[PDB]
Amino acid sequence: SPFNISFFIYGLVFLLLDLEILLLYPFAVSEYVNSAYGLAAALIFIGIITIGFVYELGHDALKVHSRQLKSSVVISYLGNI
Amino acid sequence: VALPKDAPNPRAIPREPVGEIKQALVNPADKYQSKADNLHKYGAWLMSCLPKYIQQFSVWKDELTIYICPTGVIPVFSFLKYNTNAEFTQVSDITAVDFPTREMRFEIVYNLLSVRHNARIRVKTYADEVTPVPSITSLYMGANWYEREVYDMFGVLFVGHPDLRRIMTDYGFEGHPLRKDFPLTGYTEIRYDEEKKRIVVEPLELTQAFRNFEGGSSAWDQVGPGIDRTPDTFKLPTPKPE
Amino acid sequence: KVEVYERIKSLLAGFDKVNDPNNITETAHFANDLGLDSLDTVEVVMAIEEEFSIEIPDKDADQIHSVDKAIEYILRQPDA
Amino acid sequence: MSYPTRTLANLRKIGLKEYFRQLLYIGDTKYGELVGVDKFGNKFYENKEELPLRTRWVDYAKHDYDA
Amino acid sequence: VIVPYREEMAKRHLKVSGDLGRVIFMEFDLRNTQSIEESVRHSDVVYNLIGRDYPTKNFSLADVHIEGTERIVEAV
Amino acid sequence: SNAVSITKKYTVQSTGIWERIRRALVIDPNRSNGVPLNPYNRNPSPGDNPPLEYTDPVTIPAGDIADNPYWKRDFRRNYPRPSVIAQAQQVALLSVGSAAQPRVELIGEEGTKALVAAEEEGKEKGVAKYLEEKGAEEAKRVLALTGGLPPTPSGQTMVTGQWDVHKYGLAEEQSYGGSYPCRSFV
Amino acid sequence: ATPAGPPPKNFRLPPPKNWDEESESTIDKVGKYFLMTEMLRGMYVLLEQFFRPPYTIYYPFEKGPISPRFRGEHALRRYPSGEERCIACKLCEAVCPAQAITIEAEERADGSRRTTRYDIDMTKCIYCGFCQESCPVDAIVESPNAEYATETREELLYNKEKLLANGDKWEPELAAAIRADAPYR
Amino acid sequence: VQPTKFAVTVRQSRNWADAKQRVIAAYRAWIRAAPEIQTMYSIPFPVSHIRTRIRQEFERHRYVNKLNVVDVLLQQSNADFQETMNFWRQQSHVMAFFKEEHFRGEKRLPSNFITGFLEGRN
Amino acid sequence: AEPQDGFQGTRLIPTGADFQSPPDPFIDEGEDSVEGRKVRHYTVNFGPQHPAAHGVLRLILELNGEEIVRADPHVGLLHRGTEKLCEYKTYMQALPYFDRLDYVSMMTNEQVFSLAVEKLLNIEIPPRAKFIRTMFGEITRILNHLMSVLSHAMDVGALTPFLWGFEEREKLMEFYERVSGARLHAAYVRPGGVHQDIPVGLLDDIYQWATQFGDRIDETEEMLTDNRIWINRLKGVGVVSAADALNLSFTGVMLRGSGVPWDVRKSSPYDAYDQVEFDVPVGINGDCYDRYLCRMEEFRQSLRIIHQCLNKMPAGPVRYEDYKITPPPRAAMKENMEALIHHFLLFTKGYAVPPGDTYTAIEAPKGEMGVYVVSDGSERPYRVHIRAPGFAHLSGFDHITRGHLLADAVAVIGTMDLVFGEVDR
Amino acid sequence: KGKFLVPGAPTGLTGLGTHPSPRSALLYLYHSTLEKLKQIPEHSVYRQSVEAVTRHRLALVESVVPEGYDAWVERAKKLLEEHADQFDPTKVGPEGGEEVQGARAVKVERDGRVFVVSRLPKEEDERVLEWDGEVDEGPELEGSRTLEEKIEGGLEKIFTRRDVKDTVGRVEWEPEPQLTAEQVAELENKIGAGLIEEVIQVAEGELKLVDTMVKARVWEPLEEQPRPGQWEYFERKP
Amino acid sequence: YDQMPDPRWVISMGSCANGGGYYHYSYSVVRGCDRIVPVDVYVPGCPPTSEALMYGIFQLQRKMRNTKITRMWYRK
Ligand SMILES: *P(=O)(O)OCC(C)(C)[C@H](O)C(=O)NCCC(=O)NCCSC(=O)CCCCCCCCCCCCC
Numbered sequence A: 001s002p003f004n005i006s007f008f009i010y011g012l013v014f015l016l017l018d019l020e021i022l023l024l025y026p027f028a029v030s031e032y033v034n035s036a037y038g039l040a041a042a043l044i045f046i047g048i049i050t051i052g053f054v055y056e057l058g059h060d061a062l063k064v065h066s067r068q069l070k071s072s073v074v075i076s077y078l079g080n081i
Numbered sequence B: 001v002a003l004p005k006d007a008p009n010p011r012a013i014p015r016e017p018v019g020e021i022k023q024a025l026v027n028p029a030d031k032y033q034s035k036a037d038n039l040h041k042y043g044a045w046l047m048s049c050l051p052k053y054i055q056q057f058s059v060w061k062d063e064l065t066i067y068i069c070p071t072g073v074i075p076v077f078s079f080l081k082y083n084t085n086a087e088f089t090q091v092s093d094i095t096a097v098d099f100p101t102r103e104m105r106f107e108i109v110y111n112l113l114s115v116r117h118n119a120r121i122r123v124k125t126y127a128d129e130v131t132p133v134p135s136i137t138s139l140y141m142g143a144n145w146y147e148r149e150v151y152d153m154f155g156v157l158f159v160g161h162p163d164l165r166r167i168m169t170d171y172g173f174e175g176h177p178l179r180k181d182f183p184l185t186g187y188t189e190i191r192y193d194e195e196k197k198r199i200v201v202e203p204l205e206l207t208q209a210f211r212n213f214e215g216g217s218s219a220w221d222q223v224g225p226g227i228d229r230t231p232d233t234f235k236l237p238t239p240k241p242e
Numbered sequence C: 001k002v003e004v005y006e007r008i009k010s011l012l013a014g015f016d017k018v019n020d021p022n023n024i025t026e027t028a029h030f031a032n033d034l035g036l037d038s039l040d041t042v043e044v045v046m047a048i049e050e051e052f053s054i055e056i057p058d059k060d061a062d063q064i065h066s067v068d069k070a071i072e073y074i075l076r077q078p079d080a
Numbered sequence D: 001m002s003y004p005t006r007t008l009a010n011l012r013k014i015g016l017k018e019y020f021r022q023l024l025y026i027g028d029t030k031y032g033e034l035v036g037v038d039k040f041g042n043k044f045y046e047n048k049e050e051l052p053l054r055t056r057w058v059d060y061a062k063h064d065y066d067a
Numbered sequence E: 001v002i003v004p005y006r007e008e009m010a011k012r013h014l015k016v017s018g019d020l021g022r023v024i025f026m027e028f029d030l031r032n033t034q035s036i037e038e039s040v041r042h043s044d045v046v047y048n049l050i051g052r053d054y055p056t057k058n059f060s061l062a063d064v065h066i067e068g069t070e071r072i073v074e075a076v
Numbered sequence F: 001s002n003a004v005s006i007t008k009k010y011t012v013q014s015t016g017i018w019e020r021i022r023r024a025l026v027i028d029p030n031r032s033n034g035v036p037l038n039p040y041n042r043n044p045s046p047g048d049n050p051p052l053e054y055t056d057p058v059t060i061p062a063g064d065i066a067d068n069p070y071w072k073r074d075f076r077r078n079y080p081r082p083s084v085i086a087q088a089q090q091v092a093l094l095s096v097g098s099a100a101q102p103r104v105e106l107i108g109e110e111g112t113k114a115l116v117a118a119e120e121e122g123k124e125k126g127v128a129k130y131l132e133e134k135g136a137e138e139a140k141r142v143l144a145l146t147g148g149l150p151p152t153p154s155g156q157t158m159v160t161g162q163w164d165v166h167k168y169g170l171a172e173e174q175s176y177g178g179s180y181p182c183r184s185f186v
Numbered sequence G: 001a002t003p004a005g006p007p008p009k010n011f012r013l014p015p016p017k018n019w020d021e022e023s024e025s026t027i028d029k030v031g032k033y034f035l036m037t038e039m040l041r042g043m044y045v046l047l048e049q050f051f052r053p054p055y056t057i058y059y060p061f062e063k064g065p066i067s068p069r070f071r072g073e074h075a076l077r078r079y080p081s082g083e084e085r086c087i088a089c090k091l092c093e094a095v096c097p098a099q100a101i102t103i104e105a106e107e108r109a110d111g112s113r114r115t116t117r118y119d120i121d122m123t124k125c126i127y128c129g130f131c132q133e134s135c136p137v138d139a140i141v142e143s144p145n146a147e148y149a150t151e152t153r154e155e156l157l158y159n160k161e162k163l164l165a166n167g168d169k170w171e172p173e174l175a176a177a178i179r180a181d182a183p184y185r
Numbered sequence H: 001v002q003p004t005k006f007a008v009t010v011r012q013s014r015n016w017a018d019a020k021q022r023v024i025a026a027y028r029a030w031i032r033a034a035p036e037i038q039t040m041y042s043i044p045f046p047v048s049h050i051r052t053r054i055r056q057e058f059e060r061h062r063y064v065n066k067l068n069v070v071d072v073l074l075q076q077s078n079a080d081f082q083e084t085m086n087f088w089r090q091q092s093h094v095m096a097f098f099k100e101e102h103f104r105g106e107k108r109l110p111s112n113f114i115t116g117f118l119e120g121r122n
Numbered sequence I: 001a002e003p004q005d006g007f008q009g010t011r012l013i014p015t016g017a018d019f020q021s022p023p024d025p026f027i028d029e030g031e032d033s034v035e036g037r038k039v040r041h042y043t044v045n046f047g048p049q050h051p052a053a054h055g056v057l058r059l060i061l062e063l064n065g066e067e068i069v070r071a072d073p074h075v076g077l078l079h080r081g082t083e084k085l086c087e088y089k090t091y092m093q094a095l096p097y098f099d100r101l102d103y104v105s106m107m108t109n110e111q112v113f114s115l116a117v118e119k120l121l122n123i124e125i126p127p128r129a130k131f132i133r134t135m136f137g138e139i140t141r142i143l144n145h146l147m148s149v150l151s152h153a154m155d156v157g158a159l160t161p162f163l164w165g166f167e168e169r170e171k172l173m174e175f176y177e178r179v180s181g182a183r184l185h186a187a188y189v190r191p192g193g194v195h196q197d198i199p200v201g202l203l204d205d206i207y208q209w210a211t212q213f214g215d216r217i218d219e220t221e222e223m224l225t226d227n228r229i230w231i232n233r234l235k236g237v238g239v240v241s242a243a244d245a246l247n248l249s250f251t252g253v254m255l256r257g258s259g260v261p262w263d264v265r266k267s268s269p270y271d272a273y274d275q276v277e278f279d280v281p282v283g284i285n286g287d288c289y290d291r292y293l294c295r296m297e298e299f300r301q302s303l304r305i306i307h308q309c310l311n312k313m314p315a316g317p318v319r320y321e322d323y324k325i326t327p328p329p330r331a332a333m334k335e336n337m338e339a340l341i342h343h344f345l346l347f348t349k350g351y352a353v354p355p356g357d358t359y360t361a362i363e364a365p366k367g368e369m370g371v372y373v374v375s376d377g378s379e380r381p382y383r384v385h386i387r388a389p390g391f392a393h394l395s396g397f398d399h400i401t402r403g404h405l406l407a408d409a410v411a412v413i414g415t416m417d418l419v420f421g422e423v424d425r
Numbered sequence J: 001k002g003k004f005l006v007p008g009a010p011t012g013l014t015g016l017g018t019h020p021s022p023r024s025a026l027l028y029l030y031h032s033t034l035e036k037l038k039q040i041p042e043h044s045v046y047r048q049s050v051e052a053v054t055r056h057r058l059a060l061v062e063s064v065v066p067e068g069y070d071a072w073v074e075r076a077k078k079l080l081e082e083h084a085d086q087f088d089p090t091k092v093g094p095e096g097g098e099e100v101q102g103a104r105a106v107k108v109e110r111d112g113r114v115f116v117v118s119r120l121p122k123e124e125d126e127r128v129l130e131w132d133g134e135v136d137e138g139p140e141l142e143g144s145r146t147l148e149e150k151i152e153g154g155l156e157k158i159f160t161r162r163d164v165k166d167t168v169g170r171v172e173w174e175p176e177p178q179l180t181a182e183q184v185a186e187l188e189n190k191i192g193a194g195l196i197e198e199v200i201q202v203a204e205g206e207l208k209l210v211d212t213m214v215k216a217r218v219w220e221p222l223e224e225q226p227r228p229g230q231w232e233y234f235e236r237k238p
Numbered sequence K: 001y002d003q004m005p006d007p008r009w010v011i012s013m014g015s016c017a018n019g020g021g022y023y024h025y026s027y028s029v030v031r032g033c034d035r036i037v038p039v040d041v042y043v044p045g046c047p048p049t050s051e052a053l054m055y056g057i058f059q060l061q062r063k064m065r066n067t068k069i070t071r072m073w074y075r076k
């Protein structure tokens, strides 16, 4: 039977987001020398990866909206011919 | 134990004495005569509206039964579903009764409910071992399993039924257990066989045979013929003297 | 084709309901010539369907009543 | 579920030997008045300040107690 | 069927074969003569299926086969 | 308020310092703990209810020794027989009316034979053929029996004194109020 | 759906309310969402139960309550003299909904109407008390006993010997249960 | 079809020509499914032995000359076919259909008078 | 001229297909392209061996990934041939067979068979029996809802309310054992009334339990009603419209959850329900959450009825006073000739029931329970057919679940009050 | 505010929404019923019964008039004559046309009275609609195609489909005024058969019933006599 | 039952599981589960009380407590 693409998305977004968190761990153990200048680049890096998460959320690759009485007919009486 | 201040012992309150209890004698059938005329009129109007299929109707206490020929099953139930004065939009129950003394041995019984009118109606038709009945699955979704039960227990075919299969008996079960000629313990029984390493069907063998005390039925009739309660509006007039 | 007929003999001659072997022809009929009743015929077409590994529709199967009719029918079907 | 004050009191009324023996069969610290003894040697006790349905209980004569 | 057994959990499947009261279990040791002949005195046929391909701490091949049969056959 | 006082709820209460602790910490101090009281609950045990106190009651019409003949209260043997109407009977009921309301005079002779004519006609032609010969006026007559309009099915409750539908209406007190999607009907 | 007659007063719901029209402040709405207020309240309920007395009794050292009417293991009873109460009427064999009773009877050596076979198949019996209700002499009764699970099914095929022994052992309970409930029977 | 895998709506046959097509159609589906039936219930018999049983079942009713009775037999065949091709039957049910696998044999009736008499009514 | 007319097949009988009317089109609202590619479904068996929500349930589902395509419940795993056995029993002997159909709702099960037999007997039961049966009816409704709601809660993960509420079950099972001698199968309600009168201290013991039961309901609502996990598991799940619920044969809460105000106790009153006051909870969205809220409110109305029955309990006999139908008191049977004969005949032959047939329905805890009895005039019923609400409800499982998530199936199995003794009988 | 009920608003019965134009729907159904019953003989009680209930309910529906109905009717009648090609089903089809992004409207004739059925694009969020709701029939067939596959791709639709903005020769259909919420309640209080939405449901079913009754000819002699003993139970002889 | 790892036991609880019960004469009922699986303890009652079930579980525990495992192999 066919498999669900949501499983690939969970692993894909986990891996890519796991890499970005890894890349921020050096900053947390270097904050004092980095000071303001290193913080700018970290914030630039965070801002860029945040936009890809917005893409993740906006397109709902995890199927956020997976599960979900206006009448098209209106009738008018005109009477006898 | 720590008792509640305002909860005294309810056994400790003495009860007022009771003396000569008087209860009037009630015939429970009397309360339905108020509607006996209306039930006959409704049955008569149905017979007038569908004379081609309605053979007779009967009123017992507050229950109206309609007797129809098998071919009219779809037209009659359509009328009971959709007519503005008959909005029996639910099938309470479908079942069968076996009468071997009849040529059409199977009596098919439908019980309907009209929530709008707060009313119930009974529709009876008949069938045979080889004479099918129209399925009412196209008018009532709930009817699907009831007709499978009738087919399982009685062997009655419902033409137009989708997926008419057994619902109660085991797969590969032979016979229709609610037939009067089907014996109580049936024909076969199962066990686990240690050579075949699986369950096996075998001819039925009872360590103690069933004891039927039907012969103890009273040698005298115990109920009698009963009472006629047909309303006057449905009894024929009588010629006056002279 | 001729390769189909040599396979046709491989099953009809092996069939145990034939009145007499070597009675098969290029246009022999199961009923008149080979003495096959209704269901024996149903079985023969089912054995041919297995040989060519192609399922035969019930209407098409009713059309098939002779050795030639089967030889013609299998050729039309792409699978073999 | 004894609670501290209940168990501490019953310990004082019964002693540690009896306490540990009771902990070996019933798994609780119970104390009450001896209602009587049956033919088999079971001892029956009552205490009306216990929880409902726990006001009567038996101390079985036999180690392999059976109901 | 009288079934003389050694381990209770081993013989549990045999009871399913018969109706109530048909498969009867008897605790037995091949060196307990009372047990062998209590299992046999009512029977009209006795099957000896006792064998072992290996010797054990408690039974040599001669102890289980020769001495085993000899006690059973004498009971028969 | 909704809650009844804990002091009236037949459960073991707290006392002293522990009741003040309980009233200070729990979500609702009026809520019981479900432990029944041993002096009041099943006390005495039903096996020690004095047997002499209970009296087996007898209602004096059914249980008198003087004025109750069995046949007057034999309501089982007075069971109603089912009232059966076939197509022949309805044609007769349409041709000559009923005993509550006849169609013609039917006075003695020439009416007894006239009445049996309405029976054999009902047997021969059913309701449909009868109506077809007589025409649309007979059809209006069938509905004239029910007052012009076709009848309505009888109701199954007699609380108001007549058989009718039960008049479901919203209860003046909504248990959930309006905060939940469930409405109380009385 | 609705009963015949005019629509029930106010049966029709008012139109749905938009987000804009909700009569609940944002701070409360945001606070409950992020703080999980109703889940915290449910957890607090468990702590209240954590400090309430448990309902557990320590069986088999303590027992749950049973009534004089309780239907358990069957027994055959005697008169105070020791004569059997049973006179082979077969009322219990006839009324039995499960056909669990089998009886045979003749005249005893002294000419008394007594049973020769009185079996109850405890693996057929539905424990309904119909035999005890039908008995005109209080011969068949259900004892309060319920703790008689057996190793084999054959041990649950009670003959007359097993049932009369049960009555001999349980008689003081049997008389006490009859004493308490006979006024209601 | 629509309700479940092999579900066939109950219909009467219009005429004897209509009935014969269904009977041949029913036989064709049965003997075609015989290879699958073997491997699906692990039957210890060859497809030849299974297919013979299919023909005999159809031959018990070869002499029926009543249209209503045929409709009943056709409905039974469809019901048995569905509950077989769907794995609703168990190996015990299908194996019980083969009369050889009863420990008293398949010749469960006496051969003649004297064998049944000597054994005691069979 | 059937069935020889069918020997050569003339005049085929008309089906529902022959009456399909085309919709009015004016007002009717209803290459290797990858869109033509088929999708293979996998068919999964659920039960009875592999654990399911509850009971002997083989649920065969065709799935499309996570979504339900077709739902095919196989029942009969508890079909015991109850309806056939009743034809070999007297009416007395058939009564215990009704305890074992919906076997958490024993007294109302035996209530429906008693009312049907009383109707054919043409007897009016004494007022005290009517109030006892109504009182035990609402005690049995609470016992059922405690089992249904809480085990439904336990299936979706909420362990604790099941523990709390089954102590309430223990308290109410004591009342069943005090009146009869059984925790479950009381055989207490019989045609003619009830077996024996209630012991002289029972009403006060019921009253004491009644003063504390409201708190038990409230603490259950503390864990579920506002809980966002509970709401997210139930809201919008298992929706059925009011129109389809009627056409699917849905009764009780499965019908009232979709907005239809209908209770058999109101529409066709029986016993003492016309003498008591109570409200009928009705939902509006027809989902599992509405049906949960209706059942929680039914707890409170049941307690409200029980309190009224405690105060309105009249004095008098509990069995109809004709020894030709009900057994005489044991003291009468040992005292006078007439009573002993009537005792002998009722326990060997049984009472004769006038011939005829009736369909009698009650509002059982799981919905409309009905029984259809045919009497032939003898002491054994000719035919007993039982209408179980769970049978109709489970027949609608495909309709309510098709197109929805497999992860919502446990919610709707629990929203139907499903005991398979009812379903299979 | 609450003067007019909101179409699609839940009524209370699950799956039963508030009706868009309930009064005209009842008139359409009732008149469609009387016309469909004209093919039944006059001696059929079934026909006599449905007539009595429908003409009685019809009289009550006419007894409640939307405010300003007379003003609307004159223009609406005036609009049909001058633009008959825009509303005749024989030209635009029973659905009003293949354009769903636009408004459709069809004149129809029942029981001597004329009705206009209208269809409107569903109110959908602009963030989610593509090309203003125009139906996606895939892409066109590019490349080297035969004539046959071109015709199978609806190439002739190029010469007959209309751009949604293109309204030069056609006119905007104006809806009938609606009954107020007060008027709906008092009308259904007159009918006494539940909510207006339920009454419409019963009318739709009753309209469906006529076709079955005519096809079954339920007014003719009994189809099959009950053979002797067919309905004989165990009743004792009186 | 076949999928249960050893050591394993079966408790038949109730008249129906024991010998068929109220449905012993039914066409669709097995007259006791011991026709299908071997049973270690039979608990009587229809239904047995919760205490009666507990008593049977105690009997099976006493059965386990008296089971000889290392001494059974040591005998032979
Ligand atoms: P040919 O001329 O030889 O025969 C053609 C027929 C059969 C039509 C006859 O000539 C004929 O006229 N017959 C009269 C009508 C008729 O055919 N009767 C209908 C019978 S249908 C039938 O018998 C269905 C039985 C199906 C059984 C299948 C096998 C059993 C199920 C288990 C399978 C094995 C275990 C999994």
Ligand code: SF4
Residues within 6 Å of the ligand: G085, G086, G087, G088, G089, G090, G091, G092, G093, G103, G131, G134, G135, G136, G137, G138, G139, G140
């Ligand atoms: S036990 Fe009682 S009812 Fe049964 S035979 Fe003996 S005396 Fe008669």
Ligand code: SF4
Residues within 6 Å of the ligand: G092, G095, G096, G097, G098, G099, G100, G101, G120, G124, G125, G126, G127, G128, G129, G130, G131, G132
């Ligand atoms: S208790 Fe009921 S089932 Fe058991 S023997 Fe007595 S009458 Fe028969």
Ligand code: SF4
Residues within 6 Å of the ligand: G126, I100, I103, K013, K014, K015, K016, K017, K021, K022, K045, K046, K047, K048
């Ligand atoms: S309670 Fe009685 S009927 Fe129910 S399962 Fe147990 S033994 Fe069978």
